[PDB]
Nucleic acid binder design. Structure first.
Ligand SMILES: [Mg+2]
Ligand SMILES: [Mg+2]
Ligand SMILES: [Mg+2]
Ligand SMILES: [Mg+2]
Lengths: 213, 216
DNA sequence: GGCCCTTAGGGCCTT
DNA sequence: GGCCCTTAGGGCCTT
């Protein structure tokens, strides 16, 4: 379990759930240094605020197979609208951009996604292995769903549910939006989650594909 | 001139004004396809809402030479804070990421930056030139400052802030934050979308014809 | 620097 | 599908 110096928060918008089999339609990543997590920035209010030095990347993609009913509803993305905008599928350009973006961070990198172990990380591994693409060997993975459940001790643990409990308001409306809320949820329990990550972060190389292309 | 298919709105946070040879401290690009500009989406409020299919790229980087007082004050950025967050200078990682980002867009690409001809574009050209990097050809540049002035000649201030207060009668959220200002510029563009699209087709300067701010 | 407007001026617009 | 809950149990997470 290597100590992560940069935490990259990600969320994936897909054609549906694991049985589709889904493809990434939109990827979003917020890259925050560990420093900004150890001592958070606050307003004069003072409410929690996202770090000033914040590296960000969002890429839209047109998937090979169509969306499902509920998916295209909760994403605002169709296969033709993404194609109307000239967005290709998950290809080599994505990888070169993604890896360049990750290269701009100070490793080791800890990818963070809500329910990442059961969705985001396998989905990404599938799309990356199809192209023979690799992330840095020292990359690790943090899933906030088992982490926040294990730290608490019935109760809900949905992203929207967690945010509604930690922050009395309700989150904003995109992949980039979900990363935002997740980053906020993290900051609210930063020293706890930072500890959980330093101990139980799973190596990215150990993440298995969700489905073999 | 090449009909731009994807418009890339960009803004830079640098270490100062052109007279002190500034360096990029933060880049931000919003990539928007032409078909989104042609159909400006609004909320039920109803205010201008950004396109759904949108590509973002924000990169913070530590400059070699230091900021000025005012520069570091308005950006909210310092050499220490960038080094503290482990951000290197304008390197190949930036170029590979930027070019990867641009190649992800349906060409031709039209760069858009407010007062870009006098600041953003030459500064970007300078930073790219040192690394021997260059943007793909058939890519053009659009400055919204003379454009909006030129369009108003058909029948006051033209700063990014004044234009927003005049077009929306409201106040921008973030000030001198690279991502925030691009967000501001894009909203301004959408308000003049059919007009500015024409100005970009009829007269947008080629990026190859962009002269560098300085040569180090 | 380069372009703007009502005089070798005054000021804009970018950080 | 990988986990906790109490007549091949069922709801929670993610799109
Ligand atoms: Mg998710
Ligand atoms: Mg999502
Ligand atoms: Mg600017
Ligand atoms: Mg700015």
């Amino acid at each position: 379990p290597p100590r992560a110096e940069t935490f990259v928060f990600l969320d994936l918008e897909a054609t549906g759930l694991p049985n589709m089999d889904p493809e990434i339609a939109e990827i979003s990543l917020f890259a925050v240094h560990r420093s900004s997590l150890e001592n958070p920035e606050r307003d004069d209010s003072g409410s929690l605020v996202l770090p000033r030095v914040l590296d960000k990347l969002t890429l839209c993609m047109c998937p090979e197979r169509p969306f499902t009913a509920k998916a295209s509803e909760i994403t605002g993305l169709s296969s033709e609208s993404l194609m109307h905008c000239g967005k290709a599928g998950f290809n080599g350009a994505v990888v070169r951009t993604l890896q360049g973006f990750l290269s701009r961070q100070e490793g080791p990198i800890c990818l963070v996604a809500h329910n990442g172990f059961d969705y985001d990380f396998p989905l990404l591994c599938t799309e990356l292995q199809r192209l023979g693409a690799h992330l840095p060997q020292d990359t690790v993975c943090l899933d906030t769903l088992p982490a926040l459940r294990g730290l608490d001790r019935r109760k809900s643990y949905s992203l929207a549910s967690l945010f509604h409990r930690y922050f009395q308001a309700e989150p904003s409306a995109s992949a980039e939006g979900d990363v935002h809320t997740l980053l906020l949820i993290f900051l609210h329990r930063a020293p706890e989650l930072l500890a959980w990550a330093d101990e139980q972060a799973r190596s990215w190389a150990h993440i298995e594909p969700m489905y073999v292309p």
